[PDB]
Amino acid sequence: KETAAAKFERQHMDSSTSAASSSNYCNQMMKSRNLTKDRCKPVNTFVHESLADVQAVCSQKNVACKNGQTNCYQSYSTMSITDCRETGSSKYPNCAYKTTQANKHIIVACEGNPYVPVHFDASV
């Protein structure tokens, strides 16, 4: 059904905007990409860059992943990212999120042929 590469795109890529335009961005996008369906996904990051430029991070600085595998790569440049974190008063099905827009380096894990991002590891 959905490959790891397409799930990465649905949960983490937002090429349509260059930044969140309002504090309401996370409540709208978490729901539109189905991250509120059987639970409220607690934290999620969206990258506001073109697919090609995020795909290119797979040949940049190789680092270890939080899980200890070494197929993770760190972007040389900072990227526009929007950080979404569930509020303390949030309870499924009424998922509420705080938005934080920033320019940060990302660390993604890559896999397959073509070798593409499949897991968002962290932003730094």
Q: Using CB under 6 A as the criterion, which residues of the chain lie in contact with ligand P5P when the complex forms?
A: 1-4, 7
Q: Is 44 marked as binding a ligand?
A: yes
> Closer to ligand P5P at the Cβ: 20 or 58?
58
- Residue 109 near residue 118, CB atoms below 8 Å: yes
**Minimum CB distance to ligand P5P smaller for 20 or for 117:** 117
State the alpha helices, DSSP H only, in 1-124: 4-12, 25-32, 51-55
Active site residues: 12, 119
42 is known to lie in a ligand binding site? yes
Cβ-contact 50, 33 below 8 angstroms: no
Q: Taking the CA atoms of 46, 47, 48 and 50 in sequence, report the sign of the dihedral they define.
A: negative
7 or 39: whose CB is closer to ligand P5P? 7
Question: Is 43 marked within a binding site?
Answer: yes
Sequence ranges of the binding site = 7, 10, 41-45, 66, 85
